[PDB]
Design a protein around this ligand. Sequence first.
Ligand SMILES: Cc1nc2ccccc2c(=O)[nH]1
Ligand SMILES: O=C(O)CNC(=O)C(=O)O
Ligand code: NI
Ligand SMILES: [Zn+2]
Length: 331
Amino acid sequence: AQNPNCNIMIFHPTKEEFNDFDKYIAYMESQGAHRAGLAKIIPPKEWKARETYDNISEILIATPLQQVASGRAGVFTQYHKKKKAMTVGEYRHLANSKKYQTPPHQNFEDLERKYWKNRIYNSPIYGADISGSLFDENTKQWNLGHLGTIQDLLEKECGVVIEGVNTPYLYFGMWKTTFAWHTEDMDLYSINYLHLGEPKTWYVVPPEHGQRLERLARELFPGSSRGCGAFLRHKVALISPTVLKENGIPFNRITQEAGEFMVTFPYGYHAGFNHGFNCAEAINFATPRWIDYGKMASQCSCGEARVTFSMDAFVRILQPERYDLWKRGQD
Ligand SMILES: Cc1nc2ccccc2c(=O)[nH]1
Ligand SMILES: O=C(O)CNC(=O)C(=O)O
Ligand code: NI
Ligand SMILES: [Zn+2]
């Protein structure tokens, strides 16, 4: 078996290899990349997402989210407090202000130490889940707005035609902005391109060990666990690498820099934080290997994790037995 220790693999495709997206994902998996839950892809030196990022300041962040923490440094939840709209230019200025800017640090490891020591004592503001794309329409390779759709994948694999669409989301981050432990909707893949700015550090649990993380989460957030059989779907729980190690949870870490892609694989739990002002673009996608994960994906039915229009059809077709109870949480 390839990659038995479930290490995060890093790929350097040639421009020729960068033409066929599906084929390269399949290649990565043939090398065992999916066992880690996360892979890095460094694009060919000839490739660019777009010409410049000089004219992005007038993008609107309609609902910036202030991420307020509760708990202890290594085991906490965050809730999102809605703030007034601001442009990306205004957001960048805020990110760089004395209150929010990245502190002096020696290296990525030093900054990681500072993050887990001090994150809960601050409330950074995130521009998340903004529908849109920063890929030039003339960028033909690995353009996250031009991928084959999950709906068409389901149709190709299973022969059923369904409603729904599948578009990218932009994320504007600052120091300490945080993404909680989660797998994707319906345990889909995700692909994430860091367009511009400071790095993003990722943590990931191998898919074959996802249930170990779930068990620890139930122990660490016992009230949440009683309230919902899949509360990590709420995307609000954080557990530090120190606490993961103390509890023997297998995981890996890696830092993504501007110009690099990350792919998360089905049922690969991940979490992380931004180093400073940045912009990422991400979208879910599927492959034939995803279908069995989609069938088995655990759902939030307590209702906290609202399920999108498009995910309705996934549950309806792949999980017909759960559909009724699960749609009540939606309604
Ligand atoms: C990144 C990582 N380091 C470890 C060190 C000791 C024991 C376990 C781990 C682990 O799961 N991940
Ligand atoms: O970048 C973020 O804040 C969150 N991204 C993801 O969880 C992802 O790409 O799957
Ligand atoms: Ni994700
Ligand atoms: Zn729930």
